[PDB]
Amino acid sequence: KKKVIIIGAGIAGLKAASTLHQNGIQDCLVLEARDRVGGRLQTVTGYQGRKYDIGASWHHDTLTNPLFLEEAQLSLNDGRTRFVFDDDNFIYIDEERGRVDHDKELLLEIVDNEMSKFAELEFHGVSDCSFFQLVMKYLLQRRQFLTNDQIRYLPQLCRYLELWHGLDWKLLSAKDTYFGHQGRNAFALNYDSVVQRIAQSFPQNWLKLSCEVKSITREPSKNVTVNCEDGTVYNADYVIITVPQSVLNLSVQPEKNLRGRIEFQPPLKPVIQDAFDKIHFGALGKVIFEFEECCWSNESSKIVTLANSTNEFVEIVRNAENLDELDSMLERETSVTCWSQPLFFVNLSKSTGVASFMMLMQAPLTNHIESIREDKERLFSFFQPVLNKIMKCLDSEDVIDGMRPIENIANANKPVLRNIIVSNWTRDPYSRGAYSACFPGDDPVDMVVAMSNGQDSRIRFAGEHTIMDGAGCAYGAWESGRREATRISDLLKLEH
Amino acid sequence: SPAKKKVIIIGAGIAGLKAASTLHQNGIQDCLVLEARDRVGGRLQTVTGYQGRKYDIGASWHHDTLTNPLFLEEAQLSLNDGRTRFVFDDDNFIYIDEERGRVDHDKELLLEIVDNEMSKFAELEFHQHLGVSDCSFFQLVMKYLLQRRQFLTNDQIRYLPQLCRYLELWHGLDWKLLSAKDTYFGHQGRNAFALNYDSVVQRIAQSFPQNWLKLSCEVKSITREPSKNVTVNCEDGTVYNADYVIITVPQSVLNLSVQPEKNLRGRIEFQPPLKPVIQDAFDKIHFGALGKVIFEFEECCWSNESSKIVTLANSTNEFVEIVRNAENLDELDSMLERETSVTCWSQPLFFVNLSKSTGVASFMMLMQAPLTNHIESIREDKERLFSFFQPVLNKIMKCLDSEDVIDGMRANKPVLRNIIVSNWTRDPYSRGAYSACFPGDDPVDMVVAMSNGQDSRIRFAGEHTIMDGAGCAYGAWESGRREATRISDLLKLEHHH
Ligand SMILES: Cc1cc2nc3c(=O)[nH]c(=O)nc-3n(C[C@H](O)[C@H](O)[C@H](O)COP(=O)(O)OP(=O)(O)OC[C@H]3O[C@@H](n4cnc5c(N)ncnc54)[C@H](O)[C@@H]3O)c2cc1C
Ligand SMILES: Cc1cc2nc3c(=O)[nH]c(=O)nc-3n(C[C@H](O)[C@H](O)[C@H](O)COP(=O)(O)OP(=O)(O)OC[C@H]3O[C@@H](n4cnc5c(N)ncnc54)[C@H](O)[C@@H]3O)c2cc1C
Numbered sequence: 001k002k003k004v005i006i007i008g009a010g011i012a013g014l015k016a017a018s019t020l021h022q023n024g025i026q027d028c029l030v031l032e033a034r035d036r037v038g039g040r041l042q043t044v045t046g047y048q049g050r051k052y053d054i055g056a057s058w059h060h061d062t063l064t065n066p067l068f069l070e071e072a073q074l075s076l077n078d079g080r081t082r083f084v085f086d087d088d089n090f091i092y093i094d095e096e097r098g099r100v101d102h103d104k105e106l107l108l109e110i111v112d113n114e115m116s117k118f119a120e121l122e123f124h125g126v127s128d129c130s131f132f133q134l135v136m137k138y139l140l141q142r143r144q145f146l147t148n149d150q151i152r153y154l155p156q157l158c159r160y161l162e163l164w165h166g167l168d169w170k171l172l173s174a175k176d177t178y179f180g181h182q183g184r185n186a187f188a189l190n191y192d193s194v195v196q197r198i199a200q201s202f203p204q205n206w207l208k209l210s211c212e213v214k215s216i217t218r219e220p221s222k223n224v225t226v227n228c229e230d231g232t233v234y235n236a237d238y239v240i241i242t243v244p245q246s247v248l249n250l251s252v253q254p255e256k257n258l259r260g261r262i263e264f265q266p267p268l269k270p271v272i273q274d275a276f277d278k279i280h281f282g283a284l285g286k287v288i289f290e291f292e293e294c295c296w297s298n299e300s301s302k303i304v305t306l307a308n309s310t311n312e313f314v315e316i317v318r319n320a321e322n323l324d325e326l327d328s329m330l331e332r333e334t335s336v337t338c339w340s341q342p343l344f345f346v347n348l349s350k351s352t353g354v355a356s357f358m359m360l361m362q363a364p365l366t367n368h369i370e371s372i373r374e375d376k377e378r379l380f381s382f383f384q385p386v387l388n389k390i391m392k393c394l395d396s397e398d399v400i401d402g403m404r405p406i407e408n409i410a411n412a413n414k415p416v417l418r419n420i421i422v423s424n425w426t427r428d429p430y431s432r433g434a435y436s437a438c439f440p441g442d443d444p445v446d447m448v449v450a451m452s453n454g455q456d457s458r459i460r461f462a463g464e465h466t467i468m469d470g471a472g473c474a475y476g477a478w479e480s481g482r483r484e485a486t487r488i489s490d491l492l493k494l495e496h
Numbered sequence: 497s498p499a500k501k502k503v504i505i506i507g508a509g510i511a512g513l514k515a516a517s518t519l520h521q522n523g524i525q526d527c528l529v530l531e532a533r534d535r536v537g538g539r540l541q542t543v544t545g546y547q548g549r550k551y552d553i554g555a556s557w558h559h560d561t562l563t564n565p566l567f568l569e570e571a572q573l574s575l576n577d578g579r580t581r582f583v584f585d586d587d588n589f590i591y592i593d594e595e596r597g598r599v600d601h602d603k604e605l606l607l608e609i610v611d612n613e614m615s616k617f618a619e620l621e622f623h624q625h626l627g628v629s630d631c632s633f634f635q636l637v638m639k640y641l642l643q644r645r646q647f648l649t650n651d652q653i654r655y656l657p658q659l660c661r662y663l664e665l666w667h668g669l670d671w672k673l674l675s676a677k678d679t680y681f682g683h684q685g686r687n688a689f690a691l692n693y694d695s696v697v698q699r700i701a702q703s704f705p706q707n708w709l710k711l712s713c714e715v716k717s718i719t720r721e722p723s724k725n726v727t728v729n730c731e732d733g734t735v736y737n738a739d740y741v742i743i744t745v746p747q748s749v750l751n752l753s754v755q756p757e758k759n760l761r762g763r764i765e766f767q768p769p770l771k772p773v774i775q776d777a778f779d780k781i782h783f784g785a786l787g788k789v790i791f792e793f794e795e796c797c798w799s800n801e802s803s804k805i806v807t808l809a810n811s812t813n814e815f816v817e818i819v820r821n822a823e824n825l826d827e828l829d830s831m832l833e834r835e836t837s838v839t840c841w842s843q844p845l846f847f848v849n850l851s852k853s854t855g856v857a858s859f860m861m862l863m864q865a866p867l868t869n870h871i872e873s874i875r876e877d878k879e880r881l882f883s884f885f886q887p888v889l890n891k892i893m894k895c896l897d898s899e900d901v902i903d904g905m906r907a908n909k910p911v912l913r914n915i916i917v918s919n920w921t922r923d924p925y926s927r928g929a930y931s932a933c934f935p936g937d938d939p940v941d942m943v944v945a946m947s948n949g950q951d952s953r954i955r956f957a958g959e960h961t962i963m964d965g966a967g968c969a970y971g972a973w974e975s976g977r978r979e980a981t982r983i984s985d986l987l988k989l990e991h992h993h
């Protein structure tokens with residue numbers, strides 16, 4: 001009955017569909033489990049109707065990013081604003097010392113650069129370790145050329161990379177930690193606008209929401225059969241599975257009952273199954289802090305508070321005689337606070353004019369914070385200390401809790417918090433995390449190869465976890481969507 | 497009659513000194529280091545100036561400290577005796593435009609950020625690409641601007657190309673003369689400023705038999721006697737016969753060998769003549785002219801915020817309008833033309849504020865060709881030099897919370913006490929700074945011809961004969977270790993049963 005059935009209406013699924021229509025292919029479907037399209041691209045609304053991408057927010061690698069370039073064209077043609085280049089000089093804040101960025105004496109950014117260079121040389125990749133292990137090796141080998149404060153603060157500064165992978169430094173693969181940024185980043189002014197434009201480019205009656213596909217079977221007759229949970233069954237010539245990696249991973253697990261899990265028959269070939277042993281998922285999370293208005297310096301749109309550090313750490317590094325001795329010596333034995341991990345804050349006031357902070361968090365904090373997302377009081381109590389330090393470093397004062405408003409003129413030039421928004425990607429069965437990430441010992445290529453090769457001729461895969469360029473990214477998934485559709489598109493046309 | 501030696505090293509620069517050090521280390525005896533100049537070190541030279549202040553007028557930094565073998569040795573020494581042999585002086589760059597003033601770490605210009613994109617653009621332009629035409633650095637930057645105009649502000653288009661040019665001071669070549677392919681090269685970590693490169697030269701110089709060193713003997717000719725021997729002639733009339741010779745003279749000096757006219761200082765007459773692969777390699781690699789000017793002041797009465805200061809050459813809003821209106825690369829190249837004297841604002845200049853890194857009240861400035869050749873051609877005219885640089889010096893002082901400079905060469909104001917200039921483009925034993933690439937050059941050719949040698953007995957060492965550390969002091973150092981090791985290996989067969 002159907003030419004192509006696309007499972008998942010995230011950017012990958014949406015582009016594929018868009019591509020099929022664009023190539024004259026008819027009778028296609030887009031089966032999405034959620035009651036909306038967009039997938040991990042979701043723009044939510046908060047205080048005074050302000051909007052925020054709770055999922056993806058930036059166009060990365062703007063030099064080669066095809067999706068971005070496409071958006072660039074549109075903006076060049078209609079003069080409308082679709083994005084803003086918000087890269088900025090990073091402001092680094094330590095609870096005790098305050099700002100430590102661009103410091104004439106700490107020069108942290110410079111040794112951070114040597115650090116990355118150090119990592120590159122290390123894997124040019126005899127045995128992988130965690131990012132934490134690599135930073136410790138660097139400090140030990142280079143301590144002769146590092147001051148005390150550099151040894152203390154640099155390791156905390158370099159962990160901003162945790163916010164790129166969504167994983168604590170002790171959980172992150174050192175080999176995959178440092179990747180090349182192909183140019184500046186462009187903050188999307190509505191990834192929902194990207195979703196809508198693509199979504200509207202194909203037959204609206206093609207979309208089926210709330211269709212949780214439960215099983216996919218390759219009928220030995222040149223036809224694929226798809227069954228959504230409710231009971232509706234379909235048959236198509238080609239199927240493009242774009243469900244996230246974490247969801248697809250349920251398939252290779254026993255006890256088919258998990259929300260989202262699809263039953264493949266025959267099962268996914270071994271090359272696919274094994275791929276999951278060297279892939280894994282990350283948990284980038286988001287907390288939005290909405291204030292009445294801006295009353296703090298807009299020197300930069302990029303701010304990072306560093307986890308607390310100690311002088312005893314420096315002493316231990318200075319005295320350690322070798323890697324092992326350093327390791328155990330570091331073993332020094334609770335309760336997580338906003339200062340237990342680095343936190344990345346986007347000061348939307350400078351880049352968008354909106355008096356709000358978009359904060360990024362990583363596992364294990366993410367899971368914990370998203371778990372208490374309904375408890376605004378606790379949320380404020382948890383982040384209040386880093387929020388106050390930031391305001392102090394930005395020439396302002398302590399934040400006023402106005403989540404339960406009480407108009408008070410006393411709040412002259414005081415920052416007044418009106419709302420807090422939290423992501424929920426780790427508890428959403430259809431996402432179960434943020435995007436593919438590497439634990440030490442992983443090999444991302446495996447999954448790319450297997451996914452791109454597909455289960456077979458009719459069973460294809462798309463998604464941010466199915467491509468090399470832009471892997472884990474919106475544009476990566478977008479392109480993976482075009483890939484599968486164009487391939488199927490050429491195949492149907494050749495049937496002449 | 498002509499004395500017999502196992503190995504004769506021509507040149508007591510770092511390659512040659514290391515060669516000798518290695519030979520002795522491996523037990524080779526009866527060797528010789530013949531140096532034309534009356535001192536050792538070559539392009540490693542530390543001079544004295546006002547009040548006995550010391551400055552390296554040639555090489556100054558240990559580059560690529562994460563892997564630099566020469567730096568690691570020095571570091572092992574300091575780690576043991578606690579003596580200070582170097583200082584990590586990397587810092588946040590201060591950028592100064594004549595009209596605008598400081599444009600570094602600017603919340604709106606964000607030049608540093610787009611500069612990073614620029615180098616990435618360059619990387620994507622050549623990185624692992626076969627069949628790509630070269631073009632000049634200047635042209636690469638123009639292309640970037642054109643293709644990214646939509647994502648750059650006017651001020652970024654105006655100032656960015658001028659900041660990018662600090663790379664001219666890494667190559668000693670003006671951006672229009674420089675090969676874009678070879679412009680960007682990775683740095684293996686931070687740089688360490690040597691506090692007496694001459695102390696590095698002396699240690700290596702003292703690590704071998706002191707009677708080996710013959711200064712003031714310029715070598716005139718090298719002859720391969722088809723009897724497995726090499727005859728070497730010093731101009732002082734002495735003749736030597738050696739089983740092996742390691743030639744470490746500068747690439748610019750060796751180039752003289754492929755031309756007629758023997759009475760040129762430094763030129764070596766080769767018989768038989770240098771193989772065609774060597775002669776022809778001189779067409780695929782050239783020589784840059786990094787130069788120096790040391791400005792010594794009475795005392796420090798300026799901000800020590802940073803030790804790294806770069807003055808940007810003048811730029812115009814007209815350029816921006818031209819990038820904006822250009823229809824394509826071909827049009828841009830065209831429009832860019834008009835109808836002129838060279839001043840201190842005609843090219844970027846790099847100033848090391850030694851007051852913060854060493855505590856010495858002096859600026860060490862780097863300059864590039866063609867400016868270097870002109871400035872050295874007037875090194876003797878101190879009043880003229882001061883007038884030429886006075887404006888960039890004044891602007892720097894202004895930006896560092898101080899006042900115009902007072903000529904004190906003959907309480908709150910900076911007083912210039914002395915000006916020192918390099919002489920590399922004029923010294924016939926250097927004839928330039930170091931090997932560099934012109935658009936279309938292929939450095940690999942020379943390295944291959946050099947490391948392979950003229951033949952089994954006639955070898956080459958020097959910054960121009962090796963890949964890792966090419967053009968650098970440690971590259972020259974390693975090249976010397978290379979040839980000496982090879983020779984030790986071969987001479988070792990002598991003791992076999
Ligand atoms: C907090 C956060 C921030 C991010 N920031 C950025 C950024 O700045 N830049 C960037 O490039 N990327 C970013 N990303 C990653 C980016 O969002 C993803 O790469 C991209 O959206 C993945 O697209 P997709 O089409 O593969 O899947 P979409 O989620 O991403 O999901 C595929 C679809 O499958 C559906 N589905 C699942 N199971 C079933 C089923 N059984 N039946 C039917 N449908 C099903 C889902 O509901 C979903 O709509 C971020 C991610 C997170 C979590
Ligand atoms: C201004 C300037 C700044 C620099 N800064 C740095 C820096 O910061 N870091 C870095 O790593 N490098 C730097 N360099 C480069 C570095 O100095 C050289 O790579 C290195 O010193 C070259 O060593 P060499 O042994 O090959 O030659 P040395 O010049 O470099 O020359 C070999 C020797 O041959 C002798 N000779 C020549 N002809 C004859 C002859 N006919 N008979 C006998 N002897 C002869 C010469 O007098 C000389 O002593 C700089 C160079 C210049 C010019």
Ligand SMILES: C/C=C\C=N/CCCC/N=C/C=C/C
Binds near residue numbers: 163164360435472473
């Ligand atoms: C600026 C900080 C985070 C921006 N978003 C990052 C999105 C994911 C980029 N690719 C990550 C891949 C991880 C394996």
Ligand SMILES: C/C=C\C=N\CCCC/N=C\C=C\C
Binds near residue numbers: 557931967
């Ligand atoms: C340190 C600032 C400028 C120049 N330093 C000297 C660099 C010498 C090596 N340059 C790189 C490659 C040369 C062939």
